[PDB]
Write a protein that binds this ligand. Structure first.
Ligand SMILES: CS(=O)(=O)N1CCN(Cc2cc3nc(-c4cccc5[nH]ncc45)nc(N4CCOCC4)c3s2)CC1
Lengths: 976, 236
């Protein structure tokens, strides 16, 4: 009833607002083409006065208000009325040539899901101060793009991936030095094969490509990966390019298409056509805050009144939990009091966070002492509180929570407050330079042993006072031997006084840069300083886009933490996303996925448009997808409805006809995968598309990659479920695969693609030739269907698809993938895994699938609880590893070796895991609620105990699972 | 004066509040979305009022068009009417749902300190910071299947009387399955004892027995069904 999308068939009464104010109501069919309606209205235009001040149809286009308050100018006259669901039936006929570059501002608001006026409607300075700041920079990139010649543009739009020395671990999975690469020309039907040195530059393939007698420069051509907007070029060795590296790594044939410069020039020119559419310190006195009234009607039996205060700098408090005057906790809410803050106004951190709450035994507002330009927040300010939003644990007053206030005024809490405005000349933060001068004016081989025992304990482990003292005492010594210790040191000194702060800031400038993996810690709650953060990102800024894309999820979640807007991180992420290899897309997608939620709506919203703006070109492709996804949401909504009155097989047909229709085959076809920005989507293999048995009936889309792409692509669209736990646990898995390969361990893992695109919406990527172990087991002749329905089903399965030589690799790939998963599961504490959620590819590769819960036991939202996930092994894995072969000590020993080796590798980068899971607290996952949650890892990884004291523990755990090998095998599918 | 009796039933009262609140807050932003959209639609109809009045002043025949325009201004007047009412009824339903959520923070935040008070009692609750057990009951030293089948025949369909194998320095396990007696080889290895290579991590031939009275024999052989409920020396 809030929108027209429910079971209804016929015509609709729409309002047509003409340029001459001529109002006309007409009954128009619901699923009518917007051009058909434009034509329809035009018929009756004359039976209404003023019929002559109008121009022809083709000089005018409709405009509307979306289901999201956005004014949608509908240029594409081919869209169905319902396919562009206007909130109210009304359509304002406007002139097609409405060129004010507010047609751009339409296009943007539409993409994002927030109308740009909303930022003006806030009227608050910073939003406007920064929208305008970014717009300057966004438009500088658009300008950077204009000069650029062919190929140089590609380096700015889709830059090739480089990976030096990764081969110095694993060598030559090629017959001799020679690499086998495949190339064919643009619309050519004949391919050519080449035997090539992996150390050559891509140009040699072009030189080889031209060696085809049929009668241009090799430089006038470019190598595009066949079926992807992925390109390979540059004065670099073939093996160095991530593409090649992968084909080499998975013994796959690199597929290249040769594009003539004029075809990339063409794309550049069509994109540049759209680009043209761009038309005091010395205040030695104490600090105190005065406030007036509140606004609660709430009543309590055991306790009457409620009122609190207090101030922090991250986790560290700078004052005691200040209380307030008791009023009427059942009736009267109005009052006044001068709030005592036993802290000097001079010795105050510019990143100080003034927090407030009430006696919970109930709401909260936390607002910063300083503002966007470091001006002392003074004068009368209103604080819109977060009622029933406090978390179970907070240390009386919550310091973690947002500084950005509640969007609701009516029937949502508020607070009145005043700060010392007094003087006509205000007080601003001490300069970025003046604090170094403050430090310059102010001006261990034995210890090497002690501090190594201090500056080691995991990021979540908080030091005790005496340790803090020595860390600061021997601060210069550790700077020289333990540079990686600054995270510990930065927490040693109390931020209460400026003298230490100055010396601390001095250290940072003269402190070396820690690696990006390390730097990441300096972006959590612990470190809120505007200069440590400026250096933290400093290090990130010196990281690859491929390395960047890795920690991107949680980097976005740090934007959620950020108290301001023009921060170095936002500036960095946008700076990076505007030069994307595929970065920009995820940056963009991850942002919409949360813009729907109040607290981030302004945050992400602004950042989003700032991207859209610097992405005037690509903009089309992102929209192509947004439309593609909406069409899916609806088809799914209809699929849910169908499933009731429709047979499993009749609802399939229903789905198939729906896809085959004009609206679908256009929208959700031939426009780029949101999961992989490089992967092209092209024609759907409709006949093979399906919907799953599940409670949300998710679609299973198959994309026959037509002529050029070797095989088919397969997506899963799932609306109704939180696809973020998977999105994070799959990313965690991608890391383990990273780390093991790093150390030297290709356990042939499959962390398949996953992206949550919005609220309970998103995509899972399909892995080709795969199968659920339950599926493999049933529907098989179980030892002539006589005994144990389970044994060797999984083996014969592999035997079926692997011939002689192939069977060895199959079982080899099975082993380490199983090993890799066995460790990674336990370590990440992935629970309630059954033969319904473990899978096997036809390559022998094993992998996991339903990530409902991590770092504790799975219990539904109503009664969410925790439990240790033991290491588990099924008889079914051993049996395959074994081959059934009664006695050995080389294969089920190779397994245990890997299992041990892997578990040990993870231990080493245990801090990397705890840091990422710590930055993922802001994201708001039902699991990740507190640091008590990340504490699971410390245990799983045996982080205190030494390598061999901890190996022994796991060596036991592994054997104990071999004891429960059939016992667990039973739990996998007996009742299940 | 009350101490530890229960907890679990009052614990789940939080979700009885939170499951409906999360749905209600979600509906409130959804209901506010429409008022923004509604209030934005009006803006377009309002602009029409201005344009129809400005475009009408264009009289550059004038008598019949005086009322035809007037009628249409007065119908356009009547549209913005029903759409101001339509917006107001939704604005009334926001006020309702929002009022209900305030009477829920009156219930939610009142039961939250119940666990905070529990902390002093809850975290202080501290105290801490088989007939196979006999060797001879199943062991039968140096024997032959012939002499093993002998004893076991007549006994219950799940008895254990373990011999010593024909094979040099090995062992065997003679067992009465649901039907009759079956004999499998148990092995010695540095890893321990057990019927098959990856599954032979048993320090003693007894701790094995003790870990196979619980677990089935089926894994090593489909033929070998039943575990070990009775060794030798039954009551009565
Ligand atoms: C014919 S039918 O589809 O109607 N029917 C229902 C389910 N089917 C088995 C499967 C279930 C399944 N669920 C998931 C999933 C479920 C929920 C959350 C998830 N996150 N990631 C995967 C996933 N992910 C899957 N893929 C597999 C390979 O690429 C990868 C995923 C598969 S394959 C067969 C019988």
């Amino acid at each position: 009833a809030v929108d027209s999308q429910i079971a209804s068939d016929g015509a609709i009464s729409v309002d047509f607002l003409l340029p001459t104010g001529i109002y006309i109501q007409l009954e128009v069919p619901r699923e009518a083409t917007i051009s058909y309606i434009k034509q329809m209205l035009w018929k009756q235009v004359h039976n209404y006065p003023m019929f002559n001040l109008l121009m022809d149809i083709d000089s005018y286009m409709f405009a509307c208000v979306n289901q999201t308050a956005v004014y949608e100018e509908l240029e594409d006259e081919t869209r169905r009325l319902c396919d562009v669901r206007p909130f109210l039936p009304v359509l304002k006929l406007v002139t097609r040539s409405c060129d004010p570059a507010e047609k751009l501002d339409s296009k943007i608001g539409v993409l994002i899901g927030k109308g740009l006026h909303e930022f003006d409607a806030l009227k608050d300075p910073e939003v406007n101060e920064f929208r305008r700041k970014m717009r300057k920079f966004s438009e500088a990139k658009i300008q950077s793009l204009v000069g650029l010649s062919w190929i140089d543009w590609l380096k700015h739009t889709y830059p090739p991936e480089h990976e030096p020395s990764v081969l110095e671990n694993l060598e030559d999975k090629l017959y001799g030095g020679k690499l086998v690469v495949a190339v064919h020309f643009e619309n050519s039907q004949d391919v050519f094969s080449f035997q090539v040195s992996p150390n050559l530059n891509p140009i040699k393939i072009n030189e080889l490509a031209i060696q085809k007698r049929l009668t241009a420069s090799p430089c006038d051509y470019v190598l595009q990966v066949s079926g992807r907007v992925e390109y390979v070029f540059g004065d670099h060795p073939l093996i160095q390019f991530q593409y090649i590296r992968n084909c080499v790594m998975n013994r796959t044939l690199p597929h290249f298409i040769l594009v003539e410069c004029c075809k990339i020039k063409k794309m550049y020119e069509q994109e540049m056509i759209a680009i043209e559419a761009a038309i005091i310190w010395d205040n030695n006195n104490p600090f105190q805050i005065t406030l007036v009234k509140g606004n609660k009607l709430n009543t309590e039996e055991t306790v009457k009144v409620h009122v609190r205060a207090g101030l922090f700098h991250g986790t560290e408090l700078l004052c005691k939990t200040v209380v307030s005057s008791e009023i009427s906790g059942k009736n009267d809410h109005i009052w006044n009091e001068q709030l005592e803050f036993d802290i000097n106004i001079c010795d105050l951190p510019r990143m100080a966070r003034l927090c407030f709450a009430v006696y919970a035994v109930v709401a909260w507002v936390n607002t910063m002492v300083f503002d966007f330009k470091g001006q002392l927040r003074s004068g009368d300010v209103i604080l819109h509180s977060w009622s029933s939003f406090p978390d179970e644990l907070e240390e009386m007053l919550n310091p973690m929570g947002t500084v950005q206030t509640n969007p609701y005024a009516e029937n949502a809490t508020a607070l009145h407050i005043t700060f010392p405005e007094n003087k006509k000349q205000p007080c601003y933060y001490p300069p970025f330079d003046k604090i170094i001068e403050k430090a310059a004016e102010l001006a261990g081989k034995k210890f090497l042993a002690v501090l190594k025992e201090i500056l080691d304990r995991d990021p979540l482990s908080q030091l005790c006072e005496n340790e803090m003292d020595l860390i600061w005492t021997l601060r210069q010594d550790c700077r020289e031997n333990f540079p990686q210790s600054l995270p510990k040191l930065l927490l040693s000194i109390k931020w209460n006084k400026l003298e230490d702060v100055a010396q601390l800031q001095a250290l940072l400038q003269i402190w070396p840069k820690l690696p990006p993996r390390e730097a990441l810690e300096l972006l959590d709650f612990n470190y809120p300083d505007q200069y440590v953060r400026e250096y933290a990102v400093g290090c990130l800024r010196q990281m690859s886009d491929e390395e960047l894309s890795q920690y991107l999820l949680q980097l976005v979640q740090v934007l959620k933490y950020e108290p301001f807007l023009d921060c170095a991180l936002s500036r960095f992420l946008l700076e990076r996303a505007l030069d994307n290899r595929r970065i920009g897309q995820f940056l963009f997608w991850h942002l919409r996925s949360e813009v729907h939620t109040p607290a981030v709506s302004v945050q992400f919203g602004v950042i989003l448009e700032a991207y859209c703006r610097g992405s005037v070109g690509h903009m089309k492709v992102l929209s192509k997808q947004v439309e593609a996804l909406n069409k899916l949401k609806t088809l799914n909504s209809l699929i849910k409805l169908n499933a009731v009155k429709l047979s499993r097989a009749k609802g399939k047909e229903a789905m198939h006809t729906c896809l085959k229709q004009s609206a679908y085959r256009e929208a959700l076809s031939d426009l780029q995968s949101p999961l992989n920005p490089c992967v092209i989507l092209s024609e759907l293999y409709v006949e093979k598309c399906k919907y799953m048995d599940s409670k949300m009936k998710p679609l299973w889309l198959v994309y026959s990659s037509r002529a050029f792409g070797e095989d088919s692509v397969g997506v899963i669209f799932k609306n109704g479920d939180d696809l973020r736990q998977d999105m994070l646990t799959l990313q965690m898995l991608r890391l383990m695969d990273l780390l093991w390969k790093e150390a030297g361990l290709d356990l042939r893992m499959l962390p398949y693609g996953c992206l949550a695109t919005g609220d309970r919406s998103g995509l899972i990527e399909v892995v080709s030739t795969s199968e659920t172990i339950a599926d493999i087991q049933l529907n098989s002749s179980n030892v002539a269907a006589t005994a144990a329905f389970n044994k060797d089903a999984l083996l014969n399965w592999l035997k079926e698809y692997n011939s002689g030589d192939d069977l060895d690799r199959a079982i080899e790939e099975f082993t380490l993938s199983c090993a890799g998963y066995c460790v990674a599961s336990y370590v990440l504490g992935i629970g309630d895994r059954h033969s319904d959620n473990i899978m096997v590819k036809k390559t022998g590769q094993l992998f996991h699938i339903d990530f409902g819960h991590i770092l504790g036991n799975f219990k539904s939202k109503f009664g969410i609880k925790r439990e240790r996930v033991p290491f588990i092994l099924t008889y079914d894995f051993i049996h395959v590893i074994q081959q059934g072969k009664t006695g050995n000590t080389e294969k089920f020993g190779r397994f245990r070796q890997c299992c041990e080796d892997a578990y040990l590798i993870l231990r080493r980068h245990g801090n990397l895991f705890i840091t990422l899971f710590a930055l993922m607290l802001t994201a708001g996952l039902p699991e990740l609620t507190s640091v008590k949650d990340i504490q699971y890892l410390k245990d799983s990884l045996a982080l205190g105990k030494s390598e061999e004291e901890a190996l022994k523990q796991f060596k036991q755990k592994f054997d104990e699972a071999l004891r429960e090998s059939w016992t667990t095998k039973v739990n996998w599918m007996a009742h299940t | 004066k009350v101490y530890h009796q229960q907890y679990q039933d009052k614990s789940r009262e939080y979700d009885q509040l939170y499951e409906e609140y999360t749905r209600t807050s979600q509906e409130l932003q959804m209901k506010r979305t429409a008022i923004e959209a509604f209030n934005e639609t009006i803006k377009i109809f309002e602009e029409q009022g201005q344009t129809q009045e400005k475009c009408s002043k264009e009289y550059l025949g004038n008598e019949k068009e005086m009322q035809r325009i007037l009628l249409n201004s007065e119908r356009l007047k009547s549209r913005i009417a029903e759409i101001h009412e339509s917006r107001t009824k939704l604005e009334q339903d926001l006020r309702a749902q929002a009022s209900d959520n305030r009477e829920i923070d009156k219930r939610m935040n009142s039961l939250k300190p119940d666990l905070m008070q529990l902390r002093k009692i809850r975290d202080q609750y501290l105290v801490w910071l088989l007939p196979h057990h006999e060797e001879r009951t199943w062991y039968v030293g140096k024997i032959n299947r012939t002499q093993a089948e002998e004893m076991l025949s007549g006994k219950r369909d799940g008895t254990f009387l373990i011999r010593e194998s024909s094979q040099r320095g090995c062992y065997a396990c003679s067992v009465v399955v649901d039907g009759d007696t079956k004999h499998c080889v148990i092995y010695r290895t540095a890893t321990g004892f057990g019927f098959a290579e990856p599954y032979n991590l048993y320090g003693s031939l007894k701790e094995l027995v003790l870990h196979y009275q619980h677990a089935s024999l089926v894994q090593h052989n489909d033929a070998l069904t039943v575990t070990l409920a009775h060794p030798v020396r039954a009551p009565g």
